[PDB]
Design an enzyme around this catalytic site. Structure first.
Site, PDB file in Angstrom:
ATOM      1  N   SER A  93       1.121  -9.121  -7.810  1.00  0.00           N
ATOM      2  CA  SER A  93       0.448  -8.318  -8.870  1.00  0.00           C
ATOM      3  C   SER A  93       0.497  -8.960 -10.233  1.00  0.00           C
ATOM      4  O   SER A  93      -0.258  -8.552 -11.116  1.00  0.00           O
ATOM      5  CB  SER A  93       1.010  -6.887  -8.917  1.00  0.00           C
ATOM      6  OG  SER A  93       0.748  -6.306  -7.634  1.00  0.00           O
TER       7      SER A  93
HETATM    8  C1  IM2 Z   1       1.779  -6.128  -6.655  1.00  0.00           C
HETATM    9  O1  IM2 Z   1       2.775  -6.813  -6.738  1.00  0.00           O
HETATM   10  C2  IM2 Z   1       1.682  -5.114  -5.519  1.00  0.00           C
HETATM   11  C3  IM2 Z   1       0.855  -5.755  -4.394  1.00  0.00           C
HETATM   12  C4  IM2 Z   1       0.252  -4.746  -3.438  1.00  0.00           C
HETATM   13  O2  IM2 Z   1      -0.062  -6.795  -4.728  1.00  0.00           O
HETATM   14  C5  IM2 Z   1       1.383  -3.678  -6.017  1.00  0.00           C
HETATM   15  C6  IM2 Z   1       2.304  -2.500  -5.623  1.00  0.00           C
HETATM   16  C7  IM2 Z   1       3.094  -2.307  -6.904  1.00  0.00           C
HETATM   17  S1  IM2 Z   1       3.705  -0.949  -7.620  1.00  0.00           S
HETATM   18  C8  IM2 Z   1       2.719   0.487  -7.909  1.00  0.00           C
HETATM   19  C9  IM2 Z   1       3.228   1.672  -7.085  1.00  0.00           C
HETATM   20  N1  IM2 Z   1       2.451   2.886  -7.292  1.00  0.00           N
HETATM   21  C10 IM2 Z   1       2.198   3.332  -8.528  1.00  0.00           C
HETATM   22  N2  IM2 Z   1       1.529   4.388  -8.710  1.00  0.00           N
HETATM   23  C11 IM2 Z   1       3.128  -3.414  -7.556  1.00  0.00           C
HETATM   24  C12 IM2 Z   1       4.132  -4.094  -8.447  1.00  0.00           C
HETATM   25  O3  IM2 Z   1       3.705  -4.366  -9.577  1.00  0.00           O
HETATM   26  O4  IM2 Z   1       5.331  -4.424  -8.153  1.00  0.00           O
HETATM   27  N3  IM2 Z   1       1.982  -3.873  -7.315  1.00  0.00           N
END
Ligand code: IM2
Length: 252
Positions: A58
């Protein structure tokens, strides 16, 4: 895909300082890198480990945001995208987003919709000019999620600093809109900006990141923590970052 894809080997020409932050890391494994604008100097814990390349997950949404801004997929008056009605297991994803809510809540579908609009050759040109890790786009799908594209902890700092601090082809208004989306904390002493990343492989945390920058009244610091083992989550990489920055004097 190649022999140099898991490794950043280019010599640091700058002044650098080796850190010992092993007590803050505890039972987690990884590295921490910081650059100070005023010192033109790097501060690195676990230098060898900071040069191993990992999927950015992310944290690459910083660049997808900058690309979507650069190509006018989103702008200053309107960065809104409607939800396609698909149910996600987090309710923060199950609604309309703008750049700010999507960055804050790391809403994959928003940035996936941006990426899908961006031609492969633009991304290739950008990753070359930015020197973004192994620059390996592979299948060009969700290439930044546990896939072909990999970048080192050391490179997360160099690349983000150079993108934001050089007079390049990215506009000042785009850089400011991205910054606004990354702001996490502001008080009398500092402004802290950044973005977590977590990779999950077969149910387990594999890969944690927190990449960002701090503006104080004296200096501007870009930094990145990577976690490769222990409890390697984005949340954990954020906490370890905060503890290190505070010890170093960056947060007052
Ligand atoms: C990014 O690192 C991931 C990945 C799927 O690419 C997503 C999941 C999360 S956290 C958000 C959770 N729900 C919120 N409403 C992340 C992260 O930044 O660690 N990104």
């Amino acid at each position: 895909q190649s022999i140099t894809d898991y490794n950043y080997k280019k010599p640091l020409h700058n002044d650098y300082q080796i850190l010992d932050k092993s007590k803050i890391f505890g039972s987690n494994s990884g590295s921490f890198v910081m650059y100070s604008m005023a010192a033109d100097a790097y501060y690195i814990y676990n230098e060898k480990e900071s040069r191993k390349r990992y999927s950015p997950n992310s944290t690459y949404k910083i660049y997808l945001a900058m690309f979507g801004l650069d190509r006018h997929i989103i702008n200053d008056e309107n960065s809104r995208m409607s939800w396609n009605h698909k149910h996600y297991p987090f309710d923060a994803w199950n609604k309309e987003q703008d750049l700010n809510t999507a960055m804050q809540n790391s809403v994959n579908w928003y940035f996936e919709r941006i990426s899908d609009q961006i031609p492969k050759n633009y991304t290739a040109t950008q990753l070359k000019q930015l020197n973004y890790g192994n620059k390996n786009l592979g299948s060009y799908k969700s290439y930044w999620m546990e896939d072909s594209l990999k970048i080192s902890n050391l490179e997360q700092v160099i690349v983000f600093k150079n993108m934001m601090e050089q007079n390049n082809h990215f506009s000042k208004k785009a850089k400011n809109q991205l910054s606004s989306s990354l702001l996490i904390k502001k008080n009398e002493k500092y402004e802290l900006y950044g973005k977590t990343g977590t990779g999950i492989v077969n149910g387990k945390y594999n890969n944690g990141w927190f990449v960002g920058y701090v503006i104080t009244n004296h200096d501007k610091y870009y930094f990145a923590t990577h976690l490769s083992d222990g409890k390697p989550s984005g949340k954990n990489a954020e906490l370890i970052s905060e503890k290190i920055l505070k010890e170093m004097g960056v947060l007052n």
